[PDB]
RNA sequence: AGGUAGCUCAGUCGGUAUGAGCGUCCGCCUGAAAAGCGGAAGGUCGGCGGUUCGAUCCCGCCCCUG
């Protein structure tokens, strides 16, 4: 977790207590305070607890029990006062003279595990030697807990020596507060929240400066790499046998770091305390002058994990005359790695470019404790303070000699002031943003707490943020500091008056109407996924040049075989249809209103446009034109029974005309007229497929799916489908003014014979064109083929309703209009009056 | 006897929740703005004051579009509609936007890679955090009833400063506790600058909430899978939606 | 704050009826002359207690409507007489129902706000004016076309309009047999939400149709919207993905046992494993016996956590058949 | 071929005009109030001066 | 370790797929159903290659799950 920060409460209270003695707070209160000022507390983990006899022990003899498969040993352990116990253990990460934690019978471990006496193998097992996990202390169960030599004497209480009354806070730090990735930063934040005096654990009052009587190692720095500060300090004559004390290993463990040798333990400890990453180079392994430069085109390097990594010309690294020493701020090489062989180390304190580390650690896939903090900026003013804190602590543990020499590169034009530029802000600006009249001097006081120098001048404050807050750059940044410390709960609730709005657009309103209309007719809306099913267009048998195959593709899809974004809504609808059918819901009508993604030859990347200004109109047009077309579609699919069976009858199966009607439901909801014309267009059935036109513009297709597609795709037989482009349907706002004549009507029927492939709509249009204004209604009610008609023919019978606007229409006037209708049908479609 | 020869259908519950949210803000004089799902990195990140080569951007759960240098993506949030709206409209601006958003999260009971958000944006003279709170409270009261309360606590987004997370409280919940609802803040002056607006004359606030999350804790939907898989048994109990 | 729930529901009802083929009319509040005598209503029928206008435009039409049906039937007759014989009309409007508490109030001083009792007394002195929704149908419900000869209006079409309005209001209804003019006594349902009556539906009485000059087979619906409680449900459906088991059950009952009662009994015994039940056959004949009918339901069983075995489904089905026997005297079909 | 087995109905044009007017004013922050058709002379005339 | 009929599974050690249950179809039963009997349809044996006169079976690579 690249934003996580784990630390124990006791260590946090210690740093806070230096400037505020006797400060102690319940874990639950601390949790609320951290939340109030802007830190997410993911988890609060109390250590332990243990009840009963849990005592530090000393392993006397290890009579290994041979013969078994796994290594099993019987141990004699002193529980103090030389009253010996016999225990059986399976771990093998300890020898004679080690300190361990034993759990005698009667004790109860976390959680609900009471230790009793048992006969394990061939000996009696009184208690058990515990691991850090069994004690709810650490996370390692591969080996038992070995306290360092001299951590306590046998007989001491285990709960006391292990500090099982402590509590561990796990926090998620926002990427703008990298200074909180340390005990220094969070302690400072608590001091602000509780109005306490704060003693910076990195100030020279707390880390007395070590002597600088010369340069510590040759160093050349390419200034283009982004390095801001590079420091070095050697330690000579360390004891390779000595280990880190218990208080240091315990704090390392509670923070999620496992101890190794003291040279590496102190670098990880000072990084956790002060926030400045620290690396230990074996001074005896460094051969020549150290150089900070970019990497060559193919220069590779192995890390201290043994894996070689292909570097890039943008990677910053440190290298001597032999080989590369480290990838700067990412991970060190195995060359200069400190070992139990090492005696003289060279500590490095470096400040790397954040963007450069972020690039390299992501391209190489290794986020480290160092890389996380460099990604979020590290306080460049404390490099030597953390270097002297590290060297002084290492000799105090490894019994060495702190070499009084130091190299400190501060830039080609050297830098002695690390503070960001000052900021001008009106004193009441926080009050205006908060909507709260803060008491006099609140802004100046809060901004001093976070570490900024504040100067007044009438109504204007000049704020110079501290070096550990590069995020404080504008007045708005300072406003956040004031408001979050005062607490956002004091901000009142004032409903702003908005201007008179205009409501929903015509297109927003139409999308609602279409949805209401399809739902009321029995369709069920689905949210359609934009990731096409694998191979869908091959299942459809589309040609290779079909426009629907030109898809936008995602580089990192969740399913590797589904990277294509949909150009049509039907595959997602057909997938939801198959899901319903396979679950026993076989009579299904589904629809969706959603955009598709259709790239063109103009679809392309656009390089970064400067964000310190509004983009020009051409830049806006570049951006818009570079994106794939994303029009709004409406689509629907149907399978099984369109109408269910019931006491009325056996129901009606889905047919193509149900898809044509969904088209008409959409057209009515859109208040447009449509025409359906025969068409051939996969995946539709070529004899049961209409193309839909508004005026002379194509807007989509409807009908029954192709039987070959249905079989290849595992769809229900007879599945039908509709897809229309809503963006191609023009918005209409008609103002009807109907003529409503109250005079009686005349009803007549006409039967017309035409060729069998003449569309019935074309005949009805011809009948209407000739009948004229007296025709009020025409409805087809019979389509007949038979031997009395002849082959290749069909008979259509229309019911006609005639009416006049000013008179009682006579049958002769109606028959004359009917005769003109028949004549028009004769001339336009070859209709022959039925005889 | 049963009489329904044409069974009722159903609009989708998330769509209907979106319609209720839209109507809530239109009734307050606001308007509804729109934006595409495939978006430029310019509007998804850069104009929203996201740093380049920085964890605030690189550790977003982003679907990137081929080719490698396309700088195209499936938008990770509806906040690019802020940029498009400020470029297209004259001030003052009071808008919401409701649309689909995409993150690289596996589908489980509480996550879905495809979800919906409602974005809110208000840029005018004299707008403050208190105006943000008032809108959030009206929004909460309309979606959760007259007992609804909101609370804000500091947080971070590149496009706001100050930033906060919004919790909501309503009765007959769980029966009542704070639930995470979304994020908000004052519009960053760098966002106004990138749209040609003078941060010395105009200020603004914005917010954003996920609709599937809202529907999950408001209705007590255990499995987010049911909201996205298209089973008719999930939608029909919500009714036609007309 | 926008539209109220009641205003939103009135829109939804009209959208739902219009989409289903109904045409809204604006109903006149002046009743036709002697309509309740054409309907054969009793002299003490509450619908006869009407508010009256002193100066109507038609001297023989001074009474304000207690029901929306006469205005709807007047517009239906107008359509039919102009040659539009296949008609479905609806109206959403208030009616006027005076009580004994309907009376006049003296002038209240206007130089100050009236008191709270004055306000209450002015409101209580007005006739009750609740919102009703009503519809009428005649002719073909479904037109003829290339698909077939269409389908004439039947009482089930009026019952379905009830369910259209109930779904739009998001309430459940039950339809119980009833005798209530001007409806046909054998083709008339009273509509209940819970145990509150909210109106009636069905086919109109043939004698009413004859005396009123109405199309034969006219059907009608009237519901009191103010009696339908407003609801804001928060569904949370259970969507099990485990396979279902499909079984049909065929049950014989007395011929006047309502099919809904048999379905309720079946459902009550089957328990949570029953996902869906649907009646798809109603049969009479010599095999069944005089005064009896056979009902066949399609059942769909499904478990929430496992693949349901046939025997588990059959045990739920047996419990369903047993509950039907106990509750409505149902007998398994042989 | 004709496909509309259930012909569309229609809400009344006056009702639809009313709905457009209502939506116009709700979008401006206004609300919609109601009143009976049979009214007292007190409110129809006297309190209206 | 396994992938064998639409699904769930036996089986085949280089030249005959030897199969079951379910499902589907078809008869009987019912006015019609469900269930129940009776019978039938149903198999490049995971993909791309090698070897061989010949590959479900042997060799290589790879996809899929525990
Ligand atoms: N975009 C944020 C929400 C947000 C919107 C606007 C302002 C602040 C926060 C998200 O996706 O979570
Ligand atoms: K949709
Ligand atoms: K990203
Ligand atoms: Mg900030
Ligand atoms: Mg005639
Ligand atoms: Mg004919
Ligand atoms: Mg009936
Ligand atoms: Mg069965
Ligand atoms: Mg079966
Ligand atoms: Mg029979
Ligand atoms: Mg055979």
**What DSSP string describes A353-374?**
-HHHHHHHHHHHT---HHHHHH
Tokens of B185: 């803040």
User: Between chains, do C259 and B2 touch, taking CB under 8 Å as contact?
Assistant: yes
Chain-centroid distance of CA B127 in Å reads 20
Tokens 């011929």 map to which residue?
A: C255
Closest-CA residue to A454 (of A440, A470, A467, A443): A443
Between CA A825 and CA A831, with CA A829 as vertex, the angle to 5 degrees is: 55
3-state secondary structure of A538: helix
Pairing relation of β-strands B160-169 and B72-74?
unpaired
Cα A205 to averaged position of ligand 4 atoms, centre (Å) = 29
State the nearest Cα–Cα gap between D26 and chain C, in angstroms.
6
* Alpha-carbon torsion (B42, B46, B49, B55), positive or negative: positive
Tokens of A711: 């079989």
Q: How many CA atoms lie within 13 A of A381 on its CB side?
A: 15
Cα B204 to averaged position of ligand 6 atoms, centre (Å) = 70
Query: DSSP secondary-structure letter at A124?
Result: E
Tokens of D19: 């709905």
Instruction: Report CA-CA distances (Å) from A379 to A48, A358, A480.
Output: 36, 17, 20
**A660 and chain D in contact, CB less than 8 A:** yes
Query: DSSP secondary-structure letter at C214?
Result: P
DSSP for C245-305 reads EEEEEEEEEETTS-HHHHHHHHHHHHGGGEEEEEEEEEE-STTT-TTEEEEEEEEEEE-SS
CATH number for the domain formed by residue range(s) C244-332: 3.30.70.380
Distance CA D9, CA C141 (A): 12
The interface residues of chain A toward chain D in range 723-752, judged by CB-CB distance below 8 A, are 736
Element (H, E) at A179: none
For residue C114, how many other CB atoms are within 10 A of its CB?
Answer: 16
User: How many angstroms is the resolution?
Assistant: 2.4
Question: CA A714 – C1' E58 distance (Å)?
Answer: 36
Cα A527 to averaged position of ligand 2 atoms, centre (Å) = 5
Instruction: Report CA-CA distances (Å) from A611 to A358, B193, C328.
Output: 21, 8, 77
Distance CA A90, CA B143 (A): 60
Phi, psi angles (nearest 5°) of residue C135: -155, 150
3-state helix, strand, coil in chain D (%, to 5): 40, 0, 55
Question: CA A298 – C1' E48 distance (Å)?
Answer: 35
Tokens 């032999």 map to which residue?
A: A322
Q: How many CA atoms lie within 13 A of A352 on its CB side?
A: 32
Distance CA B212, CA B100 (A): 11
Report whether C227 contacts C190 (CB < 8 A).
no
Residues of chain C with Cβ-Cβ distance to A503 below 8 Å are none
Report whether C71 contacts C28 (CB < 8 A).
yes
* Alpha-carbon torsion (A462, A465, A467, A470), positive or negative: negative
Report whether B209 contacts B140 (CB < 8 A).
no
Closest-CA residue to A75 (of A41, A126, A147): A126
* Alpha-carbon torsion (A554, A556, A561, A562), positive or negative: negative
Nearest CA to ligand 1 atom 6: B207
Distance CA B15, CA B118 (A): 12
For the purposes of burial, counting CB atoms within 10 Å of the CB of A610, is it exposed (0-12), middle (13-18) or buried (19 or more)? exposed
For the purposes of burial, counting CB atoms within 10 Å of the CB of B110, is it exposed (0-12), middle (13-18) or buried (19 or more)? middle
Q: Which residues of B touch D (CB under 8 A)?
A: 6, 26-29
Report whether A647 contacts C281 (CB < 8 A).
yes
Closest-CA residue to C297 (of C313, C277, C314, C274): C277
Chain-centroid distance of CA A445 in Å reads 37
Cα C260 to averaged position of ligand 10 atoms, centre (Å) = 27
For residue B162, whether the previous peptide bond is cis, meaning omega lies within 30 degrees of 0, is yes
Distance CA B221, CA C184 (A): 46
For residue C4, how many other CB atoms are within 10 A of its CB?
Answer: 14
User: Between chains, do A780 and D1 touch, taking CB under 8 Å as contact?
Assistant: yes
User: Between chains, do C146 and A745 touch, taking CB under 8 Å as contact?
Assistant: no
Say yes or no: domain C5-227 is CATH 3.30.930.10.
yes
Distance CA A469, CA A172 (A): 18
* Alpha-carbon torsion (A462, A465, A470, A476), positive or negative: negative
Report whether B174 contacts B183 (CB < 8 A).
no
Closest-CA residue to C155 (of C135, C130, C169, C133): C135
Distance CA A546, CA A548 (A): 5
Distance CA C39, CA C97 (A): 18
Q: Which residues of A touch C (CB under 8 A)?
A: 516-517, 520-521, 583-584, 644-648, 657, 742, 744-745, 747, 760, 779-783, 801, 803
Nearest CA to ligand 1 atom 12: B183
Q: How many CA atoms lie within 13 A of B195 on its CB side?
A: 29
User: Between chains, do D46 and C107 touch, taking CB under 8 Å as contact?
Assistant: yes
Report whether B17 contacts A532 (CB < 8 A).
no
- Shortest CA–C1' contact from C247: which nucleotide? E34
Straight-line distance from the first to the last Cα atom of chain B, in angstroms, rounded to the nearest whole number: 25
Solved by what technique? X-ray
Tokens of A575: 């997938």
Find residues whose C-beta atom lies within 7 angstroms of strand E: C 246-250, 281, 283, 285, 287, 294, 296, 310, 333
Tokens of C10: 């009135």
User: Between chains, do A530 and B37 touch, taking CB under 8 Å as contact?
Assistant: yes
Closest-CA residue to A187 (of A203, A176, A175): A203
Tokens 């030599």 map to which residue?
A: A149
Which residues approach ligand 1 with their CB closer than 6 A?
B 77, 79, 119, 157, 160, 182-185, 206-208
Distance CA A181, CA B55 (A): 14
For the purposes of burial, counting CB atoms within 10 Å of the CB of C44, is it exposed (0-12), middle (13-18) or buried (19 or more)? exposed
Return the CA Rg of chain D: 19
Instruction: Report CA-CA distances (Å) from C7 to B140, C18, D39.
Output: 22, 17, 21
The domain made up of A423-490 has a fold known as: Phenylalanyl-tRNA Synthetase; Chain B, domain 1 (3.30.56)
Closest-CA residue to A135 (of A155, A119, A115): A115
Distance CA A480, CA A482 (A): 6
- Shortest CA–C1' contact from C248: which nucleotide? E34
CATH number for the domain formed by residue range(s) A54-167: 2.40.50.140
* C157, C163, C239: residue with CB nearest B233: C239
Distance CA A274, CA A280 (A): 17
* C1, C20, C105: residue with CB nearest D6: C20
Distance CA A682, CA A131 (A): 67
For residue A149, whether the previous peptide bond is cis, meaning omega lies within 30 degrees of 0, is no
Which ligand has the nearest atom to the CA of A796?
Answer: 6
Report whether A57 contacts A159 (CB < 8 A).
no
User: Which bases in strand E are touched by protein, i.e. have an atom under 7 Å from a CB?
Assistant: 30-36
Chain-centroid distance of CA C35 in Å reads 22
CATH number for the domain formed by residue range(s) A219-409: 3.50.40.10
Closest-CA residue to A634 (of A509, A528, A521, A504): A528
Report whether A483 contacts A434 (CB < 8 A).
yes
Instruction: Report CA-CA distances (Å) from C110 to A366, C107, C123, D2, D49.
Output: 83, 9, 17, 64, 8
State the nearest Cα–Cα gap between C145 and chain A, in angstroms.
4
Does A481 count as an annotated binding residue? Answer: yes
Residue to mutate (ligand 1; options B79, B95, B159, B186; most atoms within 8 A of CB): B79
Report whether B29 contacts A500 (CB < 8 A).
yes
What CA dihedral angle connects A523, A524, A525 and A528, to 10 degrees?
-110
Chain-centroid distance of CA A683 in Å reads 37
DSSP for A389-434 reads HHHHHHHHHH--EE-S--EEE-TTTT-S--PPPPEEEETTHHHHHH
DSSP for B60-102 reads S--EEBSSTT--EEE-SSSTHHHHHHHHHSPSSEEEEEEEEEE
Tokens 């919790």 map to which residue?
A: B167
Distance CA B154, CA A38 (A): 4
Element (H, E) at A327: strand A324-327
Closest-CA residue to A227 (of A383, A99, A340): A383
For residue A53, how many other CB atoms are within 10 A of its CB?
Answer: 17
Element (H, E) at A686: strand A684-694
Closest-CA residue to A253 (of A407, A139, A413): A139
CATH number for the domain formed by residue range(s) A745-833: 3.30.70.380
Tokens of D17: 């005009």
Tokens of A394: 């290492």
For the purposes of burial, counting CB atoms within 10 Å of the CB of A792, is it exposed (0-12), middle (13-18) or buried (19 or more)? exposed
- Measured from the Cα of B101, ligand 1's closest atom is 11
For residue C230, how many other CB atoms are within 10 A of its CB?
Answer: 13
Domain limits of chain C?
A: 5-227, 244-332
Residues near B103 by beta carbon (within 8 Å), at least 6 away in sequence: B60, B61, B62, B63, B76, B113, B115
Report the CATH architecture of A506-728.
2-Layer Sandwich (3.30)
Report whether C139 contacts C86 (CB < 8 A).
yes
Closest-CA residue to C252 (of C210, C216, C289, C302): C289
Which stretches of A468-555 are assigned E, i.e. beta strand? 524-525
Distance CA A383, CA A386 (A): 5
Does A153 count as an annotated binding residue? Answer: no
Question: CA C310 – C1' E29 distance (Å)?
Answer: 21
3-state secondary structure of A262: helix
- Shortest CA–C1' contact from C282: which nucleotide? E32
Residues near C16 by beta carbon (within 8 Å), at least 6 away in sequence: A520, B240, B242, C164, C165, C167, C168
Return the CA Rg of chain C: 25
Straight-line distance from the first to the last Cα atom of chain D, in angstroms, rounded to the nearest whole number: 64
What CA dihedral angle connects A369, A370, A376 and A380, to 10 degrees?
140
Residues near D48 by beta carbon (within 8 Å), at least 6 away in sequence: none
Helical packing angle, A183-193 and A9-17, nearest 10°:
60
Does A601 count as an annotated binding residue? Answer: no
Chain-centroid distance of CA C196 in Å reads 13
3-state secondary structure of A497: coil
User: Between chains, do A657 and D3 touch, taking CB under 8 Å as contact?
Assistant: yes
Distance CA A391, CA A410 (A): 20
Report whether A473 contacts A423 (CB < 8 A).
yes
Q: How many CA atoms lie within 13 A of A825 on its CB side?
A: 31
Tokens of A599: 């790239």
Closest-CA residue to C274 (of C298, C306, C295, C305): C298
Distance CA A175, CA B240 (A): 45
Query: DSSP secondary-structure letter at C226?
Result: G
For the purposes of burial, counting CB atoms within 10 Å of the CB of C250, is it exposed (0-12), middle (13-18) or buried (19 or more)? middle
Straight-line distance from the first to the last Cα atom of chain C, in angstroms, rounded to the nearest whole number: 62
HEC string for B164-195? EEEEEECCCCCCCCCEEEEEEEEECHHHHHHC
User: Between chains, do A515 and B137 touch, taking CB under 8 Å as contact?
Assistant: no
Residues near A200 by beta carbon (within 8 Å), at least 6 away in sequence: A184, A188, A206
Return the CA Rg of chain B: 19
DSSP for A67-117 reads TSSS-EEEEEEE-STT-EEEEEE---S--TT-EEEEE-TT-EETTTEE---
Which stretches of A580-682 are assigned E, i.e. beta strand? 588-595, 632-639, 641-643, 652-653, 675-678
Instruction: Report CA-CA distances (Å) from A810 to A161, A768, A816.
Output: 114, 19, 10
Distance CA A357, CA A342 (A): 29
Tokens of A91: 């771990």
Does A471 count as an annotated binding residue? Answer: yes
Buried b / exposed e along B216-230 (16+ C-beta atoms within 10 A): bbbeebebbbbbbbb
Distance CA A713, CA A541 (A): 11
User: Between chains, do C170 and B3 touch, taking CB under 8 Å as contact?
Assistant: no
Tokens of A469: 């807050």
Which ligand has the nearest atom to the CA of A362?
Answer: 3
3-state secondary structure of A711: helix
**Residues listed for chain C:** 334
State the nearest Cα–Cα gap between D15 and chain B, in angstroms.
17
Straight-line distance from the first to the last Cα atom of chain A, in angstroms, rounded to the nearest whole number: 87
């Amino acid at each position: 977790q690249s934003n996580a920060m784990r630390l124990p409460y006791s260590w946090l209270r210690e740093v806070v207590a230096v400037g505020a003695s006797g400060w102690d707070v319940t874990p639950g209160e601390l949790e609320q305070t951290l939340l109030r000022i802007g830190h997410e507390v993911e988890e609060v983990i109390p250590l332990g607890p243990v009840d009963g006899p849990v005592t530090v022990g000393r392993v006397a003899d290890i009579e290994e029990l041979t013969g078994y498969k796994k290594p099993i040993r019987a141990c004699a352990v002193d529980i103090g006062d030389r009253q010996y116990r016999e225990i059986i253990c399976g771990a093998t990460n300890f020898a004679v003279g080690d300190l361990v934690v034993v759990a005698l019978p009667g004790a109860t471990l976390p959680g609900g595990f009471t230790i009793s006496a048992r006969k394990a193998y061939g000996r009696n097992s009184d208690g058990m030697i515990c691991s850090a996990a069994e004690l709810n202390l650490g996370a390692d169960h591969s080996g038992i807990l070995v306290l360092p030599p001299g951590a306590a004497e046998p007989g001491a209480d285990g709960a006391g020596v292990l500090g099982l009354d402590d509590v561990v806070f796990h926090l998620a730090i926002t990427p703008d507060r990298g200074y909180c990735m340390s005990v220094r930063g969070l302690a400072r934040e608590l001091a602000c929240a509780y109005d306490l005096d704060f003693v910076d654990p990195a100030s020279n009052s707390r880390v007395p400066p070590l002597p600088i009587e010369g340069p510590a190692w040759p160093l050349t720095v390419q200034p283009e790499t982004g390095v801001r500060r590079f420091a070095l300090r050697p330690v000579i004559g360390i004891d390779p046998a000595a280990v880190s004390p218990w208080w240091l290993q315990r704090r390392l463990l509670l923070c999620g770091i496992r101890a190794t040798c003291p040279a590496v333990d102190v670098t990880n400890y000072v990084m956790l305390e002060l926030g400045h990453p620290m690396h230990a180079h074996d001074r005896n392994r460094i051969s020549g002058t150290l150089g900070v430069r970019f990497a060559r085109s193919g220069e590779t390097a192995v890390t201290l994990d043994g894996i070689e990594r292909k570097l890039d010309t943008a990677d910053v690294l440190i290298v001597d005359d032999a080989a590369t020493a480290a990838i700067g701020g990412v991970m060190g090489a195995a060359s200069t790695e400190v070992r139990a062989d090492s005696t003289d180390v060279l500590l490095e304190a470096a400040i790397w470019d954040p963007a450069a580390v972020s690039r390299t650690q992501r391209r190489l896939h290794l986020p480290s404790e160092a890389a996380r903090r460099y990604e979020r900026t590290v306080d460049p003013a404390i490099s030597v303070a953390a270097l002297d804190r590290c060297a002084r602590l290492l000799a105090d543990i490894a019994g060495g000699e702190v070499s009084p020499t130091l190299t400190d590169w501060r830039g080609d034009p050297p830098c002695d002031d690390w503070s960001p530029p000052p900021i001008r802000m009106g004193v009441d600006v926080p009050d205006r943003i908060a909507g709260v009249a803060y008491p006099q001097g609140t802004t100046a006081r809060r901004l001093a707490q976070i570490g900024a120098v504040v100067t007044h001048d009438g109504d204007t404050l000049t704020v110079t943020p501290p070096s550990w807050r590069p995020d404080l750059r504008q007045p708005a940044d300072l406003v956040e500091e004031v408001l979050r410390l005062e607490g956002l709960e004091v901000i009142p609730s004032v409903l702003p008056p908005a201007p008179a709005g205009r409501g929903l657009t015509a297109g927003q309103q139409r999308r609602r109407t279409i949805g209401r209309s399809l739902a009321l007719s029995g369709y069920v809306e689905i949210l359609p996924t934009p990731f096409l099913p694998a191979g869908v267009f091959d299942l459809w048998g589309l040609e290779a040049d079909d426009s629907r195959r030109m898809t936008t593709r995602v580089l990192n899809p969740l399913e590797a075989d589904r990277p294509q974004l949909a150009t049509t809504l039907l595959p997602a609808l057909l997938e939801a249809l198959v899901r319903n059918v396979s679950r026993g819901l076989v009579d299904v009508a589904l629809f969706a209103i959603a955009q598709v993604v259709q790239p063109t030859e103009q679809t392309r990347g656009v390089g970064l446009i400067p964000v310190d200004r509004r983009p020009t109109d051409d830049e806006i047009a570049m951006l818009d034109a570079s994106l794939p077309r994303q029009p709004q579609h409406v689509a629907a699919v149907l399978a099984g029974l369109r109408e269910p069976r019931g006491p009325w009858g056996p129901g009606r199966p889905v047919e193509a005309a149900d898809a044509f009607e969904a088209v008409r439901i959409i057209a009515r909801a859109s208040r447009v007229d449509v025409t359906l014309r025969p068409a051939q267009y996969l995946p539709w059935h070529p004899g049961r497929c209409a193309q839909v036109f508004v005026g002379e513009s194509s807007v989509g297709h409807a009908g029954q799916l192709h039987p070959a597609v249905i079989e290849r795709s595992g769809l229900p037989k007879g599945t039908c489908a509709v897809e229309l482009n809503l963006d191609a349907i023009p918005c209409s706002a008609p103002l009807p003014a109907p003529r409503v004549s109250p005079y009686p009507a005349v009803f007549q029927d006409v039967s017309l014979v035409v060729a069998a492939d003449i569309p019935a709509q074309a005949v009805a249009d011809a009948v209407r064109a000739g009948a004229g204004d007296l025709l009020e209604d025409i409805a087809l009610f019979d389509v007949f083929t038979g031997p009395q008609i002849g082959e290749h023919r069909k008979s259509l019978t229309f019911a006609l309703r005639f009416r006049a606007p000013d008179r009682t229409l006579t049958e002769d006037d109606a028959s004359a209009a009917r005769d003109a209708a028949v004549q028009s049908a004769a001339e336009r479609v070859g209709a022959v009056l039925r005889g | 006897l049963p009489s329904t020869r044409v069974p009722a259908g159903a609009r989708h519950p998330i769509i209907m929740l979106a319609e209720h949210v839209a109507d809530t803000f239109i009734a307050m004089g606001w308007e509804l703005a729109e934006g595409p799902e495939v978006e430029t990195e310019q509007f998804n990140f850069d104009a929203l004051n996201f740093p380049a080569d920085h964890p605030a951007r690189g550790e977003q759960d982003t679907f990137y579009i081929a080719p490698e240098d396309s700088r195209q993506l499936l938008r990770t949030h509806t906040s690019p509609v802020q940029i498009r709206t400020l470029l297209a409209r004259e001030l003052p601006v009071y808008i919401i936007s409701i649309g689909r958003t995409f993150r690289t999260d596996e589908l489980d009971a509480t996550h879905t890679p495809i979800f919906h958000q409602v974005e809110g944006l208000a840029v005018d003279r004299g707008l403050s955090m208190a105006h943000l709170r008032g809108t959030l409270d009206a929004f909460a009261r309309a979606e959760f009833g007259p007992s609804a309360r909101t609370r804000i606590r500091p947080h971070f987004f590149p496009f706001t400063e100050p930033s906060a997370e919004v919790d909501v409280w309503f009765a007959n919940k769980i029966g009542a506790a704070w639930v995470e609802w979304g994020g908000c803040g004052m519009v960053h002056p760098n966002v106004l600058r990138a749209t040609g607006i003078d941060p010395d004359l105009y200020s603004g606030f914005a917010f954003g909430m996920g609709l599937e999350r809202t529907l999950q804790f408001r209705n007590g939907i255990p499995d987010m899978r049911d909201m996205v898989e298209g089973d008719v048994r999930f939608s029909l109990p919500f009714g036609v939606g007309a």
